[PDB]
């Protein structure tokens, strides 16, 4: 037992009363008084006392007392004395069934946070207490017990699944299932909500009972209560993903019931139902079980893709046309998003088979006079595009012109979704004669880039970037107009849209390439970019996209970038240097210095490597005057994989040109580069192989010692078929380059790498990397034919992969083929290939 003193109790009640004042100064001052009184050992005990024994006090005061006790728990429970902790536990369990739903909710969260803050083994009797209390004859105790149980199961599923308190679930799951029968709908909702927490974990206590679970779940399917239907749909989604075998016998009835729920009047029930279509489309059996239901399902999903009245109001689409929280509200998942995504995945799985069901609906929506219906039709046409392109093509000559008209529609929403749909059909648009569809499309899209409405602007920029990626060189005749409008966009845009504008400009540079290097384009594009570059300070996060954009420009312009190089270069160095400095400082004293944002040095290395790539030898007079070398060395010493990746990329680029200044540091680079290679941080390993290739081909025969330490690691990488194709291809390329410059160490290894070397390099398009790698393998076979006797078929395949190679490479292949045809076998090898490859071999 414990008792309060009257004056202290009354002072605490007065503070709780004053905590409800509208005056923020009163709130702050009484919060301060409370934070001070928290020092009192039994303050929390008075607080629970107000929550529980003073039934005479008004419910808001009691509720807030409970909530602030919950905060005190979360912050300080570890230093509560045992007496008050026991009082809290016992008393809140005594009042878990209090009449007021508000009091019962506060007590529920208080119990939940006590149990979560401590370990359940700090309160071992809690679960038996709640389980036994579920059997209450009084309703309120039962309801509160089950509510707190639901919260505990949601917060603490894993700890309940552990051996902690002797597998409690083994008794609870039979209990919860037994309460699916309960008369009160709220109790049934709690029961299903609790059981649902243990489906995805595949908890044995439940999976030992899935038959009873699904039987009672179907017995419960017909409930009137929206919460019950919500939780039943959620349970069936999870069970589909996990224990699909049991659901499969009843899949037809489950599908029909879940479609009925997809049409449910309550929006939450409908959303839960739509998740069923998304998850089912991911199971391999979907294309066989759901076909019979498509004619009933597609019209439903389509009908679900209309905006709700609430979305139309929030989007202000209702308004004539002559913010951040708006986005927060719209973006959040809803029935429209989910229906569109479900239709998208259904399109991906059924492809042309789904077209004859949706197309009659689509050709009604597209030309409907209600703008909401038209908008949903545009969204439908855009959603199925990716999966259904091959069957949709015949109608594009008819639809694309109307979509291009819709880009001029009065309603902003129609305009935006039209931009996105045309983006989805960009590839087919590009395939056609430019003057027929591409030029009108880009004209309208650029007119919308400067639209009045910001989401229209964002949609237009995204669509134009995708269209550029499809168009590539097709853009060049229109490049003046593209640049004019984009650089005008800088003068209009605002920060939220400015990053997608950067996306558009960077994509333009990437797709156009050296064609962008004209004086008018340079003096039109650069001034605003360097204006933003001067505007931003080194600490601004908005600097990440800009540099990520600028690098593209810098490479696309190649030497044309030179007048703007030096101030960029210098700053780009300083950034990484700073991030290194603080980083090591943070490593020395984490309390004195926080870990700096690695993204600055990552993007700085990326931009600097791209700058070296673009400028070639012209960057030598800068890197000679810089500490850059040491810095990137440290960047490859750093454990973080991204900086290692970026620094090896920069090493490769500074090796393509200006290697003469890198060379003295090779003795320091190579040991750590080879060491970093093998652990196979996929991107880091890939760049490490490629850097080894560059530095080896630069070094020549002088590379003697660095070959053994890398070659064993490289062939070990080739030993792993799990390597992604790019990494393995570059490993083979660098093996070839090493075999070219230093054969003697590679001489034993031909048999170990030639086969995957062939199967990888046969699919790279005859560039200088492939040229040097094949030169290397030719050198290797000339040095050791014995290593490829059992593998000449792979050599023939690799040599045949070349389409009209250089004359000297052709002669090397020719001479070595006429060599090992003598040194039947060559005829049989060439017979393994189709007419083209065999003919190429014969011509050689």
């Amino acid at each position: 037992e414990w008792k309060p003193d009257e004056q202290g109790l009354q002072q605490i009640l007065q503070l709780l009363k004053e905590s409800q004042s509208p005056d923020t100064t009163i709130q702050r001052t009484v919060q301060q008084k409370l934070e001070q009184l928290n020092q009192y050992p039994d303050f929390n005990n008075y607080l629970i006392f107000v929550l529980t024994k003073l039934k005479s006090e008004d419910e808001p005061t009691r509720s807030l007392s409970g909530l602030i006790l919950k905060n005190n728990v979360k912050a300080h429970f570890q230093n509560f004395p045992n007496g008050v902790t026991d009082f809290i536990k016992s008393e809140c369990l005594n009042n878990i069934g209090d009449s007021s739903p508000l009091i019962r909710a506060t007590v529920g969260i208080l119990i939940t946070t006590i149990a979560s803050k401590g370990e359940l083994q700090n309160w071992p009797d809690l679960l038996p207490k709640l389980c036994s209390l579920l059997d209450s004859e009084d309703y309120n105790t039962c309801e509160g017990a089950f509510g707190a149980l639901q919260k505990i199961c949601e917060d603490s599923a894993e700890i309940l699944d552990s051996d902690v308190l002797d597998r409690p679930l083994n008794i609870m799951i039979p209990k919860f299932l037994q309460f699916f029968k309960h008369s009160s709908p709220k109790i049934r909702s709690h029961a299903v909500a609790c059981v649902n927490q243990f489906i995805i974990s595949r908890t044995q206590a439940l999976m030992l009972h899935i038959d009873s679970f699904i039987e009672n779940l179907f017995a419960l399917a017909g409930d009137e209560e929206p919460e019950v239907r919500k939780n039943v749909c959620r349970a069936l989604v999870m069970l589909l993903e996990v224990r699909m075998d049991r659901l499969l016998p009843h899949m037809h009835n489950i599908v029909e019931y879940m479609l009925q729920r997809t049409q449910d009047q309550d929006e939450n029930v409908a959303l839960e139902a739509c998740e069923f279509w998304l998850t089912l489309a991911e199971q391999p059996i979907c294309k066989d079980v759901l076909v019979r239901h498509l004619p009933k399902l597609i019209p439903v999903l389509v009908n679900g893709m209309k905006y709700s009245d609430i979305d139309i109001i929030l989007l202000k689409g209702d308004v004539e046309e002559d913010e951040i929280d708006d986005d927060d509200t719209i973006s959040d998942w809803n029935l429209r998003k989910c229906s569109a995504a479900a239709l998208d995945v259904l399109a991906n799985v059924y492809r042309d088979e789904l077209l004859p069901h949706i197309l009659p609906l689509l050709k009604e929506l597209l030309f409907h006079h209600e703008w909401v219906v038209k908008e949903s039709g545009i969204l439908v046409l855009g959603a199925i595009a990716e999966g259904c392109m091959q069957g949709m093509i015949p109608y594009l000559p008819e639809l694309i012109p109307h979509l291009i008209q819709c880009l001029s529609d009065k309603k902003a929403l129609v305009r935006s979704i039209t931009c996105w749909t045309l983006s989805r059909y960009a590839h087919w648009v590009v395939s056609q004669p430019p003057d027929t569809y591409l030029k009108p499309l880009m004209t309208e899209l650029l007119k919308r880039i400067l639209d009045s409405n910001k989401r229209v602007q964002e949609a237009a920029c995204s669509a134009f970037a995708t269209l550029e990626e499809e168009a590539c060189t097709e853009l060049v005749p229109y490049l003046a107009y593209i640049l004019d409008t984009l650089v005008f966009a800088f003068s209009k845009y605002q920060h939220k849209n400015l990053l997608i504008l950067y996306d558009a400009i960077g994509t333009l540079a990437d797709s156009v390439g050296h064609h962008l290097n004209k004086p008018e384009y340079i003096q039109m594009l650069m001034p605003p970019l360097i204006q933003k570059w001067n505007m931003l300070k080194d600490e601004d996060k908005d600097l990440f996209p800009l540099l990520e954009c600028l690098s593209s420009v810098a490479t696309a312009l190649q030497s044309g970038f030179l007048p703007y190089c030096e101030p960029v270069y210098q700053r780009c160095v300083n950034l990484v240097q700073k991030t290194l400095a603080q980083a090591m400082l943070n490593n020395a004293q984490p309390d004195q210095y926080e870990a700096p944002d690695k993204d600055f040095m990552i993007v700085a290395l990326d931009l600097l490597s791209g700058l070296a790539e673009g400028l070639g030898g012209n960057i030598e007079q800068l890197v000679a005057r810089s500490n850059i070398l040491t810095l990137m060395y440290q960047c490859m010493q750093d454990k973080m994989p991204e900086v290692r990746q970026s620094s090896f990329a920069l090493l490769g680029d500074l090796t393509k040109a200006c290697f003469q200044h890198v060379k003295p540091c090779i003795a320091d680079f190579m040991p750590i580069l080879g060491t970093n290679l093998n652990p196979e941080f996929i991107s880091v390993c890939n760049n490490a192989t490629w850097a080894i290739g560059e530095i080896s081909i630069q070094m020549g025969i002088e590379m003697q010692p660095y070959i053994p330490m890398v070659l064993h690691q490289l062939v070990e990488i080739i030993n792993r078929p799990n390597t992604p194709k790019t990494l393995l291809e570059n490993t083979a390329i660098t093996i070839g380059r090493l075999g070219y410059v230093c054969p003697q160490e590679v001489a034993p290894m031909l048999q170990q790498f030639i086969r995957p070397w062939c199967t990888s390099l046969r699919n790279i398009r005859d560039n200088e990397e492939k040229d040097s790698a094949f030169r290397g393998i030719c050198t290797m076979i000339s040095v050791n034919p014995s290593g490829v006797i059992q593998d000449f078929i792979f050599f023939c395949d690799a040599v045949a992969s070349w389409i009209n190679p250089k004359d000297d490479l052709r002669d090397m292949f020719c001479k070595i083929l006429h060599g090992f045809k003598n040194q039947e076998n060559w005829r049989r090898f060439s017979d393994q290939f189709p007419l083209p490859l065999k003919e190429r071999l014969a011509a050689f």
């Binding site: 973006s331 998942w333 998003k337 995504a341 996105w420 983006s423 995708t466 996306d503």
Partner: peptide, 12 residues
């Protein structure tokens, strides 16, 4: 990598 879309799930 991929651009914003109309049916993108929060927490891409």
């Amino acid at each position: 990598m991929q651009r914003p879309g109309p049916y993108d799930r929060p927490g891409a």
